[PDB]
PDB file of C-alpha atoms in Angstrom:
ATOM      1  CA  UNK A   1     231.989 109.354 231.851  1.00  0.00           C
ATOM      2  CA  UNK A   2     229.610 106.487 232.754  1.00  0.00           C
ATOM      3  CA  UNK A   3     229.228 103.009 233.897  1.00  0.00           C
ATOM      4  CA  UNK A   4     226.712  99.633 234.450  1.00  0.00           C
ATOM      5  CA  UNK A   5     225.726  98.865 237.879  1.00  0.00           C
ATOM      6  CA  UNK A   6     226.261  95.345 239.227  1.00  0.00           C
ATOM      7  CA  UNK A   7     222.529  93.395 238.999  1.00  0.00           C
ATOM      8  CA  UNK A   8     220.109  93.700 241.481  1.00  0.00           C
ATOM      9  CA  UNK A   9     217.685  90.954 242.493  1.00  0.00           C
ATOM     10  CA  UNK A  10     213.886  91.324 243.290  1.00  0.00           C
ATOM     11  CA  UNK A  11     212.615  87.944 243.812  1.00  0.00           C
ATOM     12  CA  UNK A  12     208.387  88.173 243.263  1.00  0.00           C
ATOM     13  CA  UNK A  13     207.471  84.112 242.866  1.00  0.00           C
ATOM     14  CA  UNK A  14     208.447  80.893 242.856  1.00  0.00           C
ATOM     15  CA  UNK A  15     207.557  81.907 239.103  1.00  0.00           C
ATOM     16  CA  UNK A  16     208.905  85.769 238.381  1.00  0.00           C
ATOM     17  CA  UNK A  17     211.602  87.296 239.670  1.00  0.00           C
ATOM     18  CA  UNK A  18     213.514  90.409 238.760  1.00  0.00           C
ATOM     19  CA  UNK A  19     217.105  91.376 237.585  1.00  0.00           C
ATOM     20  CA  UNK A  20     217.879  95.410 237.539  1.00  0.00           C
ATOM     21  CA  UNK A  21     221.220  96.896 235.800  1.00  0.00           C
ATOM     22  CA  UNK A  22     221.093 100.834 234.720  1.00  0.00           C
ATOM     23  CA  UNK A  23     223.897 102.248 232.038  1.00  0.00           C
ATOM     24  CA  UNK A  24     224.850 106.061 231.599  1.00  0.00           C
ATOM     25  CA  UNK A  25     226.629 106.989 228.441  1.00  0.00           C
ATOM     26  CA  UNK A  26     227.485 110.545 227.984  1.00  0.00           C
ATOM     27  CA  UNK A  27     227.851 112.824 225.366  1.00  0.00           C
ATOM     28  CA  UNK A  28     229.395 115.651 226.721  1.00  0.00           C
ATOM     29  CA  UNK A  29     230.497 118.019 223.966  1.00  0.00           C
ATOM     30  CA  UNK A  30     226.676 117.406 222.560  1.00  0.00           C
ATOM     31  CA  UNK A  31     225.209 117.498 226.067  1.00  0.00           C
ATOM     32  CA  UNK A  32     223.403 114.658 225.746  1.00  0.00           C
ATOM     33  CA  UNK A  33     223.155 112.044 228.883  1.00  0.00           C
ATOM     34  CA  UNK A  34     221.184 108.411 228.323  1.00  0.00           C
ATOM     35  CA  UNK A  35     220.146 106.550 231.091  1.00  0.00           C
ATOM     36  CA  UNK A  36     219.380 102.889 230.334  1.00  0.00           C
ATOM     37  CA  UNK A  37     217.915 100.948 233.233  1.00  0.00           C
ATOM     38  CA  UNK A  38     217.211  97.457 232.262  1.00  0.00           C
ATOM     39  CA  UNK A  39     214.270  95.222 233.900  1.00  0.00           C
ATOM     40  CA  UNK A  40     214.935  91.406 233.006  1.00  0.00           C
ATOM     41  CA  UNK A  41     211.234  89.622 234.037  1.00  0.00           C
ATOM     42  CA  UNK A  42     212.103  85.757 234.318  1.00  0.00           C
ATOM     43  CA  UNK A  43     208.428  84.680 234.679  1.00  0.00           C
ATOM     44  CA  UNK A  44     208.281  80.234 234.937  1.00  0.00           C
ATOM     45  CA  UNK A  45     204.963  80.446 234.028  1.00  0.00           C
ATOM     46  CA  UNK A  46     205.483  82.135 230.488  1.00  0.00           C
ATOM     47  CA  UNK A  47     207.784  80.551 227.596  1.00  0.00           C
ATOM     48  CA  UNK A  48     208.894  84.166 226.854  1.00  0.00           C
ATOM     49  CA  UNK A  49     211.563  86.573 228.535  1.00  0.00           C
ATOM     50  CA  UNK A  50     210.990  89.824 229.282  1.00  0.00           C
ATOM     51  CA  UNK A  51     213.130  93.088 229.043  1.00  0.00           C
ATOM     52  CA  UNK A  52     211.265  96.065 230.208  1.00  0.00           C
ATOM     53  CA  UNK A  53     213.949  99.216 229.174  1.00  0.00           C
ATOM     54  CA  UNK A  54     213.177 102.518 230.956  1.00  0.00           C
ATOM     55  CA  UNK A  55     215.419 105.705 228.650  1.00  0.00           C
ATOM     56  CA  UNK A  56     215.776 108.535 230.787  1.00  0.00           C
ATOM     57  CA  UNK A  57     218.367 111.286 230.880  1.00  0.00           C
ATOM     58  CA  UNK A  58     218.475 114.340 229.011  1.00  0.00           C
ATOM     59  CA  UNK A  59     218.678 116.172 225.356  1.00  0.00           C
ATOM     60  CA  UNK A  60     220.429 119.656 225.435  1.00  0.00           C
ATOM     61  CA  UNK A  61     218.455 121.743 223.106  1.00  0.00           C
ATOM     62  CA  UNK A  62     221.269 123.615 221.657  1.00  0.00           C
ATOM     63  CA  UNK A  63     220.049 127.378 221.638  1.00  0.00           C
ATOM     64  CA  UNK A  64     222.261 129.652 220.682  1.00  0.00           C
ATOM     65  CA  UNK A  65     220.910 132.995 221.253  1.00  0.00           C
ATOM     66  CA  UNK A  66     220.845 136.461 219.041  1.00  0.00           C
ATOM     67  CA  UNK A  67     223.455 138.718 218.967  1.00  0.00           C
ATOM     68  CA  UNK A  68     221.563 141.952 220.526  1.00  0.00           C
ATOM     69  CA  UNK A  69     223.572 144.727 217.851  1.00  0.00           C
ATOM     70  CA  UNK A  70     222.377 142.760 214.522  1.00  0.00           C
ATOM     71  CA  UNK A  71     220.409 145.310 212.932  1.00  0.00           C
ATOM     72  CA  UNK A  72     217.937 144.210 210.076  1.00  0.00           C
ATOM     73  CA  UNK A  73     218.458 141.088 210.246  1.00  0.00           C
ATOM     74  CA  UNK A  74     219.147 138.323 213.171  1.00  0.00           C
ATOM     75  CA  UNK A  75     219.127 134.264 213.619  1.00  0.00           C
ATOM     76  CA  UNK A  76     218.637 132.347 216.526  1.00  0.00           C
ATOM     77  CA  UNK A  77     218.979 128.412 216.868  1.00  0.00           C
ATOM     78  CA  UNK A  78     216.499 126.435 218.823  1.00  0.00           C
ATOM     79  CA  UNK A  79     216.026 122.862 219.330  1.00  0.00           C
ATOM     80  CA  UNK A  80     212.756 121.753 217.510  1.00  0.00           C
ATOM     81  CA  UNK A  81     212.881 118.055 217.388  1.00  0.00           C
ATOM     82  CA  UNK A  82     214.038 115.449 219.829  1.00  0.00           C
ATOM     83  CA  UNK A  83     213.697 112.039 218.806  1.00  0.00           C
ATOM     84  CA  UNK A  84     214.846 108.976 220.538  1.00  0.00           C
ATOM     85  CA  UNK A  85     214.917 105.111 218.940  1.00  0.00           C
ATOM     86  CA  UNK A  86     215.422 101.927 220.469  1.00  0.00           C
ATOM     87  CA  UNK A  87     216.941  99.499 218.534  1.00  0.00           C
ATOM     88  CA  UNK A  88     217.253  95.442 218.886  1.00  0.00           C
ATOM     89  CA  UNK A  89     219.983  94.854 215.979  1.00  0.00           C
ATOM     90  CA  UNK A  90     220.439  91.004 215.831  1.00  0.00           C
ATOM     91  CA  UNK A  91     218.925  87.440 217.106  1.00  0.00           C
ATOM     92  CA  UNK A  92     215.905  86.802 215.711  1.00  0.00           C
ATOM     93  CA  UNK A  93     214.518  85.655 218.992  1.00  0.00           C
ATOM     94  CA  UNK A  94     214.472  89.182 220.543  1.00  0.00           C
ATOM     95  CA  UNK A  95     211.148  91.227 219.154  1.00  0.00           C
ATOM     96  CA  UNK A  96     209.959  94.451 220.234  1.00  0.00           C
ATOM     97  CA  UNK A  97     206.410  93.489 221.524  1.00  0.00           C
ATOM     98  CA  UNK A  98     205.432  97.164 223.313  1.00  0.00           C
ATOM     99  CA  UNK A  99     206.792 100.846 224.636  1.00  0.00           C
ATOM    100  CA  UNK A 100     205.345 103.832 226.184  1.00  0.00           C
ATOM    101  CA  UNK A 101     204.391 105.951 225.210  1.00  0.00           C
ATOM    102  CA  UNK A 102     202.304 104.126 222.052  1.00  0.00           C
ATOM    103  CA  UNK A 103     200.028 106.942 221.145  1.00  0.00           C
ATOM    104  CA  UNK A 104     200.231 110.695 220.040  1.00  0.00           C
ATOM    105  CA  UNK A 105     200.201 112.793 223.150  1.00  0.00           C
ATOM    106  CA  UNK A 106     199.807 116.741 223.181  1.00  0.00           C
ATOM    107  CA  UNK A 107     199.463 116.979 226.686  1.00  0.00           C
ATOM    108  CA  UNK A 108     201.747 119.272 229.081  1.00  0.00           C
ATOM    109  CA  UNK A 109     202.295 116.304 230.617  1.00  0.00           C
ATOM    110  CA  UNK A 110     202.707 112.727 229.123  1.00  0.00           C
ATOM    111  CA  UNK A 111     202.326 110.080 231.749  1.00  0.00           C
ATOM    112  CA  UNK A 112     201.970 106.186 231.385  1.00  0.00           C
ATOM    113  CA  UNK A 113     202.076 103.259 233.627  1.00  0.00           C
ATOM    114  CA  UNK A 114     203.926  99.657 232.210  1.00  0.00           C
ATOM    115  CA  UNK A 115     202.097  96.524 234.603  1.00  0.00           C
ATOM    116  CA  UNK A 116     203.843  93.052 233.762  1.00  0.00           C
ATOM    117  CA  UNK A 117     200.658  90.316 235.197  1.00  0.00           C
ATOM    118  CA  UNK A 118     202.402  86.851 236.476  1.00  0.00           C
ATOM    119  CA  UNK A 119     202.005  85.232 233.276  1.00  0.00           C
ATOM    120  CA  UNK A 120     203.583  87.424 230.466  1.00  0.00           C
ATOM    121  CA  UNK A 121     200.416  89.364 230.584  1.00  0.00           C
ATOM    122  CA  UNK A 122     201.531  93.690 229.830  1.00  0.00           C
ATOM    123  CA  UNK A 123     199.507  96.664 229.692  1.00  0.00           C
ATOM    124  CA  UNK A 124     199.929 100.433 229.115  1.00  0.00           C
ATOM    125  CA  UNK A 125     197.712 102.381 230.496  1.00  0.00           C
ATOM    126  CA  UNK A 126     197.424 106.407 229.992  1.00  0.00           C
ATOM    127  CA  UNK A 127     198.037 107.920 233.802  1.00  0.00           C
ATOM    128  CA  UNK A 128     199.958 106.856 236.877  1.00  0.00           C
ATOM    129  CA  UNK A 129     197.006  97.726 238.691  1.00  0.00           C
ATOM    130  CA  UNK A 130     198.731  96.004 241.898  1.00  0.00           C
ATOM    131  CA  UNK A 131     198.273  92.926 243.576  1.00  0.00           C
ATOM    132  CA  UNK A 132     197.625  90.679 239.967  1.00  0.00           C
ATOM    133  CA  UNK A 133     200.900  92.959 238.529  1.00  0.00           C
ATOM    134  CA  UNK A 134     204.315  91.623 239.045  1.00  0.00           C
ATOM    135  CA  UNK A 135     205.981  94.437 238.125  1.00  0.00           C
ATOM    136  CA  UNK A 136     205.440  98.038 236.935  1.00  0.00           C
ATOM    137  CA  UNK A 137     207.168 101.023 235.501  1.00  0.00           C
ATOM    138  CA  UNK A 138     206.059 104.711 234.687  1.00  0.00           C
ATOM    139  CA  UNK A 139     206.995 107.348 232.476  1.00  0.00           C
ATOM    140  CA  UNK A 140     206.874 111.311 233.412  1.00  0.00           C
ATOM    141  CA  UNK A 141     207.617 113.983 231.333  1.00  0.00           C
ATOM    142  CA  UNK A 142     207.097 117.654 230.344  1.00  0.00           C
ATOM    143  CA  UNK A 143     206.759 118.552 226.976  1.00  0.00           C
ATOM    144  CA  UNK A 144     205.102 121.741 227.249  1.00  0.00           C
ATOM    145  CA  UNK A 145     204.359 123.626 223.476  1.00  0.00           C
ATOM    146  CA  UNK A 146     205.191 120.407 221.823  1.00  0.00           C
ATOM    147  CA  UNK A 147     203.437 116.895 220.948  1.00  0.00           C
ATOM    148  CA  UNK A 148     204.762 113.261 221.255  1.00  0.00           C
ATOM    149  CA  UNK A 149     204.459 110.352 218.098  1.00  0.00           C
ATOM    150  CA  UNK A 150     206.104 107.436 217.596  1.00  0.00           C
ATOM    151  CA  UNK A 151     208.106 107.024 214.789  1.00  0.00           C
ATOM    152  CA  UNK A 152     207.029 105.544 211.161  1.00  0.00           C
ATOM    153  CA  UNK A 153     209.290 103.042 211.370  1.00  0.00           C
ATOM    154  CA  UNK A 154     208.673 101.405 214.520  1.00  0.00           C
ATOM    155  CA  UNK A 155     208.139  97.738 214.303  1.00  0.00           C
ATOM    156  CA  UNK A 156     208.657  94.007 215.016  1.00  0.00           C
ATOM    157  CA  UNK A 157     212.716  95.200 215.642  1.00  0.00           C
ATOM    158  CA  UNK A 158     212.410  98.888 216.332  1.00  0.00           C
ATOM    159  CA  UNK A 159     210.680 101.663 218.287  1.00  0.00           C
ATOM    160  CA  UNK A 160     211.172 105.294 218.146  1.00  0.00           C
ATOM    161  CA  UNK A 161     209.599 108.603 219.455  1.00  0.00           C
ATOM    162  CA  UNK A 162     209.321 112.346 218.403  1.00  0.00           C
ATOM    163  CA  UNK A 163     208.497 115.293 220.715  1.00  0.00           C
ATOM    164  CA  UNK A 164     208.337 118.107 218.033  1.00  0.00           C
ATOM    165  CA  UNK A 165     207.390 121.924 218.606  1.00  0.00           C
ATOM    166  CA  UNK A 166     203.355 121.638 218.402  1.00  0.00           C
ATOM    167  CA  UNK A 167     201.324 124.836 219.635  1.00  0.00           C
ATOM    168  CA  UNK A 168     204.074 127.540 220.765  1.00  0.00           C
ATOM    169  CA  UNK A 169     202.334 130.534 221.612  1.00  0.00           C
ATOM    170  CA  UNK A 170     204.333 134.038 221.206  1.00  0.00           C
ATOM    171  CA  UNK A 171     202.174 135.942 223.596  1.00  0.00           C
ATOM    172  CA  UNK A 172     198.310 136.301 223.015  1.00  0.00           C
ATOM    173  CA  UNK A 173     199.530 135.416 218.953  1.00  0.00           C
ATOM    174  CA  UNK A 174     199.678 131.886 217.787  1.00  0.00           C
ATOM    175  CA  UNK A 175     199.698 128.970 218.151  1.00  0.00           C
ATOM    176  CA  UNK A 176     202.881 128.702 216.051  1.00  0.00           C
ATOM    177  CA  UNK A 177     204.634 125.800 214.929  1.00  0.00           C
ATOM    178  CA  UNK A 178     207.875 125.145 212.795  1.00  0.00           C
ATOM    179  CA  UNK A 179     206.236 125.686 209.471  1.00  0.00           C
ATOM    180  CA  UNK A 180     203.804 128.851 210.507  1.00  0.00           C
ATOM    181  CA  UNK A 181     203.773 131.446 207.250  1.00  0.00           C
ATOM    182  CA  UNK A 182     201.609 134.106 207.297  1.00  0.00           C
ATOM    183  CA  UNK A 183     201.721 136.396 203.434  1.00  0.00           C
ATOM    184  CA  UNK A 184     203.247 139.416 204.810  1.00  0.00           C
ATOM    185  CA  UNK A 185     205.116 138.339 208.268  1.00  0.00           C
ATOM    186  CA  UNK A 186     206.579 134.532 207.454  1.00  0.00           C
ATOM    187  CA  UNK A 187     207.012 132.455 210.380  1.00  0.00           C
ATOM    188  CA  UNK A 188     206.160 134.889 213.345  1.00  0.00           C
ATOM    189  CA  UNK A 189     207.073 132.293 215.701  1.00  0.00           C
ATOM    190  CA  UNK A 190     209.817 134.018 217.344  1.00  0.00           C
ATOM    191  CA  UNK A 191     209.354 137.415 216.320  1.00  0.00           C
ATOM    192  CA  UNK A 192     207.993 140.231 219.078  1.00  0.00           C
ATOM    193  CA  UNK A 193     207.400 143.182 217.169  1.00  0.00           C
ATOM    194  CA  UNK A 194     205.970 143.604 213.286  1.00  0.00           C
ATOM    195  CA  UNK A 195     206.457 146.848 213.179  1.00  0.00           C
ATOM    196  CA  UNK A 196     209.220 147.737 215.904  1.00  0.00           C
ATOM    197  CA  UNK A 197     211.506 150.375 215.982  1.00  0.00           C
ATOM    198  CA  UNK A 198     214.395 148.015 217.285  1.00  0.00           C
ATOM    199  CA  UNK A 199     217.298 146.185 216.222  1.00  0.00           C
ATOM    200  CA  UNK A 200     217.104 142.597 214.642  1.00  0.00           C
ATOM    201  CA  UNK A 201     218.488 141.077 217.612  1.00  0.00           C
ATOM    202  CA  UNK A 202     216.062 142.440 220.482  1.00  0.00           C
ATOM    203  CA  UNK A 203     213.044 141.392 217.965  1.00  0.00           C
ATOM    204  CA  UNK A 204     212.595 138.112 219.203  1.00  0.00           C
ATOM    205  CA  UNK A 205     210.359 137.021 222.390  1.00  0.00           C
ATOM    206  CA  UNK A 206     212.366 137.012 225.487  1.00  0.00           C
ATOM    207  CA  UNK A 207     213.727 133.534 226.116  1.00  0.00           C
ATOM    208  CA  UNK A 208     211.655 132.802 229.272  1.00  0.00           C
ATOM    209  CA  UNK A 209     208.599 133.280 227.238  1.00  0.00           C
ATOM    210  CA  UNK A 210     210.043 130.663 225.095  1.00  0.00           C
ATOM    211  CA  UNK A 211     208.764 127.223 226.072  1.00  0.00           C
ATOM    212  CA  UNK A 212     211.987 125.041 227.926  1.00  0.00           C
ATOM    213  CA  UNK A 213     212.184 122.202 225.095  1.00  0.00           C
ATOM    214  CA  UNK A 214     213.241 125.333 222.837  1.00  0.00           C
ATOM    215  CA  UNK A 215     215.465 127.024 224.720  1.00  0.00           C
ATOM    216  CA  UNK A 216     217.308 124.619 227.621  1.00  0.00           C
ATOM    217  CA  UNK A 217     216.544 120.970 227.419  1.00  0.00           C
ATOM    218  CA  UNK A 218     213.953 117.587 227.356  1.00  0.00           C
ATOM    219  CA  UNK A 219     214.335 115.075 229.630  1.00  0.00           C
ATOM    220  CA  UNK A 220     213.092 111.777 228.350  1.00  0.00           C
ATOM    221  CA  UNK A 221     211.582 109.172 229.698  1.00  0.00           C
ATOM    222  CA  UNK A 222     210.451 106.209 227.384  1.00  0.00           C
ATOM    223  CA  UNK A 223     209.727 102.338 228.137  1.00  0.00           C
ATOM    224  CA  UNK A 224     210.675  99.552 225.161  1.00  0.00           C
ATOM    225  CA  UNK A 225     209.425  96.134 225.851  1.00  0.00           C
ATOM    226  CA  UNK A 226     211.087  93.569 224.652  1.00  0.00           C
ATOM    227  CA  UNK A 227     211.150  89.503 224.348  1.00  0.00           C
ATOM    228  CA  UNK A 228     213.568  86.575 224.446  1.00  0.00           C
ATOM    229  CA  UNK A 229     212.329  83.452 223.101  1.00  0.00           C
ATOM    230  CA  UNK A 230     214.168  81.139 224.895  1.00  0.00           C
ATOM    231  CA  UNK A 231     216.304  79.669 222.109  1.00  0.00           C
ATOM    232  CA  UNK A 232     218.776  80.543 219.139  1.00  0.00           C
ATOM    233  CA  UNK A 233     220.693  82.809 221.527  1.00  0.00           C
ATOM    234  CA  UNK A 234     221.482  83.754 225.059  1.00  0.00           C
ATOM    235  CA  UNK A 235     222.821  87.542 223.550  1.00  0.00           C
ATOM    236  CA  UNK A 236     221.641  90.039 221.818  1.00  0.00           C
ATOM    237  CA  UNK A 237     222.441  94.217 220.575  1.00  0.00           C
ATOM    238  CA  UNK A 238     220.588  96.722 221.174  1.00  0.00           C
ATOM    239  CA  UNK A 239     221.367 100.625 220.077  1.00  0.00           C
ATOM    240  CA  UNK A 240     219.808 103.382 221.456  1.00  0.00           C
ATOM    241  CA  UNK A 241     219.692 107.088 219.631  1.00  0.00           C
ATOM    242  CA  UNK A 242     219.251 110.230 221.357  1.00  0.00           C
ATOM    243  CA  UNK A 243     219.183 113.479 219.146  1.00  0.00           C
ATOM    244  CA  UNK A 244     218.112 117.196 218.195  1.00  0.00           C
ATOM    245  CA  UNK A 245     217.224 118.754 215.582  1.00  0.00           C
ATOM    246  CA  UNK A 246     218.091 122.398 215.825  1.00  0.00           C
ATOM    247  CA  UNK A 247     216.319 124.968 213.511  1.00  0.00           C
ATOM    248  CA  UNK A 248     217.302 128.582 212.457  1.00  0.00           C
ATOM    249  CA  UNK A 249     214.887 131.010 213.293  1.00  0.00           C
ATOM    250  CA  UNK A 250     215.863 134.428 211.776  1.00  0.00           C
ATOM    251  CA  UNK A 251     213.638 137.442 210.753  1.00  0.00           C
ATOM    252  CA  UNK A 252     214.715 140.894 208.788  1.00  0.00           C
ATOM    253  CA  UNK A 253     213.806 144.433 208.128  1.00  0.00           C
ATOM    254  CA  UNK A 254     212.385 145.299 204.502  1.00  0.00           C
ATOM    255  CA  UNK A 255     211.806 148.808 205.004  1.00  0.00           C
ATOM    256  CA  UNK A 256     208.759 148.557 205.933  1.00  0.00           C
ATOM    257  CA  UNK A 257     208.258 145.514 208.365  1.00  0.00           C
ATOM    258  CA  UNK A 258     209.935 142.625 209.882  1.00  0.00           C
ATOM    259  CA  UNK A 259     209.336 138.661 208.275  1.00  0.00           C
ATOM    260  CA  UNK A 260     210.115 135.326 209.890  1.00  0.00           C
ATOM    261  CA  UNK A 261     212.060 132.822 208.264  1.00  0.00           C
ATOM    262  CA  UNK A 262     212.388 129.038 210.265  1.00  0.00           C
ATOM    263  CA  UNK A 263     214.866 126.397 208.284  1.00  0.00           C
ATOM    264  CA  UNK A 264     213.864 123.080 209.951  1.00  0.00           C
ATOM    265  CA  UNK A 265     216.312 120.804 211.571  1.00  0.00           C
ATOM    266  CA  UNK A 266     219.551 123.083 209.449  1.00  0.00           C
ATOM    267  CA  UNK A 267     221.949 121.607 212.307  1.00  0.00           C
ATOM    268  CA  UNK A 268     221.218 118.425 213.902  1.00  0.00           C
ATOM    269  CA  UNK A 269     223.403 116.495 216.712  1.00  0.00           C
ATOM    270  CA  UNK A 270     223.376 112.785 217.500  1.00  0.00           C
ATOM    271  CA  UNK A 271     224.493 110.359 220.123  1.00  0.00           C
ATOM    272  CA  UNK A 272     224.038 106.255 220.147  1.00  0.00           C
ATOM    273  CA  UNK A 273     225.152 103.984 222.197  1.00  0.00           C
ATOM    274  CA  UNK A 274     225.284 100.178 221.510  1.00  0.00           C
ATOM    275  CA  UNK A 275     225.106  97.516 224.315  1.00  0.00           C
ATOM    276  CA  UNK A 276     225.045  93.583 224.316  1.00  0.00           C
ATOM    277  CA  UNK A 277     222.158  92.042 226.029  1.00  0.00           C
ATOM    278  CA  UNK A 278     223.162  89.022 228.210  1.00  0.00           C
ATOM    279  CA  UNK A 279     219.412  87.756 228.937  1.00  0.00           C
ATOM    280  CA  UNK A 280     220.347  84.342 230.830  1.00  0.00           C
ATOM    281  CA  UNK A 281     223.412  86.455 233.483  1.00  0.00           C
ATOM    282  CA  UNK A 282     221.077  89.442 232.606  1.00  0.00           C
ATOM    283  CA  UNK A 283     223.195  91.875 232.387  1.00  0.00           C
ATOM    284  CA  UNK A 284     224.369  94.665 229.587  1.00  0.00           C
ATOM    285  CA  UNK A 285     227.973  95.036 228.270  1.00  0.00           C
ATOM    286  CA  UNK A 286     229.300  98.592 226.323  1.00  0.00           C
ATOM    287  CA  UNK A 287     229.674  97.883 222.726  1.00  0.00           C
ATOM    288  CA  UNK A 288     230.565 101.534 221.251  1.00  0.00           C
ATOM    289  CA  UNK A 289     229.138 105.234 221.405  1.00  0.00           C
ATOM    290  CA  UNK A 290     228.780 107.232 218.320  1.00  0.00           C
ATOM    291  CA  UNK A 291     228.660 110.998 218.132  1.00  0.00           C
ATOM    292  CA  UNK A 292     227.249 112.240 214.759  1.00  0.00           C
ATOM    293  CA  UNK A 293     226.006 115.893 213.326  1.00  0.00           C
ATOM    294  CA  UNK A 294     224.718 116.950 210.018  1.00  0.00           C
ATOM    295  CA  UNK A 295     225.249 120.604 209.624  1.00  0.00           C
ATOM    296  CA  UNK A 296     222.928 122.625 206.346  1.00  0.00           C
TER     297      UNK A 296
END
């Protein structure tokens, strides 16, 4: 499946040097692959330890397409959602103190920059400071059609993300979104024709002209930093969630015209993995993975 690499060493300072260990934990029969590389920051001239954790990997979205013969009516499952939390789940010395991205993003593109200042000093910064930073990370990722926000329970012990369908636009029509509904048509989200002449199951936008979170994947990319105060404990947990929420798009025939109909998140599919923290060997030991689904 997956394994830790040994620790690397960056020495920076008489001060700050740097310890690097990455995890991969897969998922396979959810095709879902985390990437956990872990940045220990032992800075001498700051009473606080440092753990900068870069998520990458990738979220299948699940999209199962129409059946081409279905007549009057048809169903197609995209993925909608992807959310991914970061979770410290013990010590009370380890705090969540910042992440990347922090605020609500639309862009095609969402693109930070993490810069650890000798000193404890961090700051996120919307693009892509040198010779005052000690160290520095980035995030890069597509998200094209859809919009990034944290979590609403993201706090001293927790930090999460959602990259949810935002402005998908079916052609020259839209923008449409999970919860579209128009009086006569529903959710047109999906749906190519209102008044065509063909089956169910050709009545929905080619694929390609659906955006790629929807139909084929999202490959994260999120930073979580967190803090040791050098006491209590030299270990900690930490679990991180990877998941999908896949919604049912379907549309039928009255007689007359053709009518959307989206059922948000009616299948969704979850991996987390749990590792121990070892912040004074700095280095990260496999505690369990746990695949979950919830099916409507």
């Amino acid at each position: 499946e997956g394994k830790i690499t040994p620790v690397s060493v960056k020495k920076v300072d008489d001060k700050v040097t740097l310890y690097k260990t990455t995890a991969t934990a897969d998922s396979d029969k959810f095709k879902i692959s985390q990437i956990l590389t872990f940045n220990f920051i032992k800075d001498k001239s700051y009473d606080k330890d440092t753990l900068v954790l870069k998520a990458t990997g990738n979220i299948n979205s699940g999209f199962v397409k129409p059946n081409p013969n279905d007549y009057d009516f048809s169903k197609l499952y995209w993925g909608a959602k992807y959310n991914v939390s970061i979770s410290s789940q013990s010590n009370d010395s380890v705090n969540v103190v910042d992440y990347a991205p922090k605020n609500q993003n639309e862009e095609f593109q969402v693109q930070n920059t993490l810069g650890y200042t000798f000193g404890g000093d961090i700051s996120i910064s919307n693009g892509l400071l040198n010779g005052n930073t000690a160290f520095s990370e980035t995030i890069n990722y597509k998200q094209e059609s859809y919009r990034t926000t944290l979590s609403r329970n993201t706090n001293y012990k927790n930090v999460g993300w959602g990259v949810e369908a935002h402005k998908i636009m079916n052609n020259g029509w839209g923008p449409y979104g999970r919860d579209s509904f128009h009086p006569t048509y529903g959710n047109e989200l999906f749906l190519a024709g209102r008044q065509s002449s063909a089956y169910a199951g050709q009545n929905f936008i080619a694929q390609h002209q659906m955006p790629l979170l929807s139909r084929s994947n999202f490959n994260p990319e999120f930073l979580s930093v967190l803090s040791h105060r050098q006491d209590g404990a030299k270990k900690s947990k930490i679990t991180v969630t990877y998941q999908r929420e896949m919604d049912l798009y379907q549309i039928r025939w009255n007689g007359f015209y053709w009518a959307g109909a989206n059922y948000k998140n009616f299948k969704t599919r979850t991996f987390k993995s749990t590792y121990e923290i070892d912040w004074e060997n700095h280095k990260v030991k496999l505690l369990d993975t746990k695949e979950t689904e919830n099916n409507k």
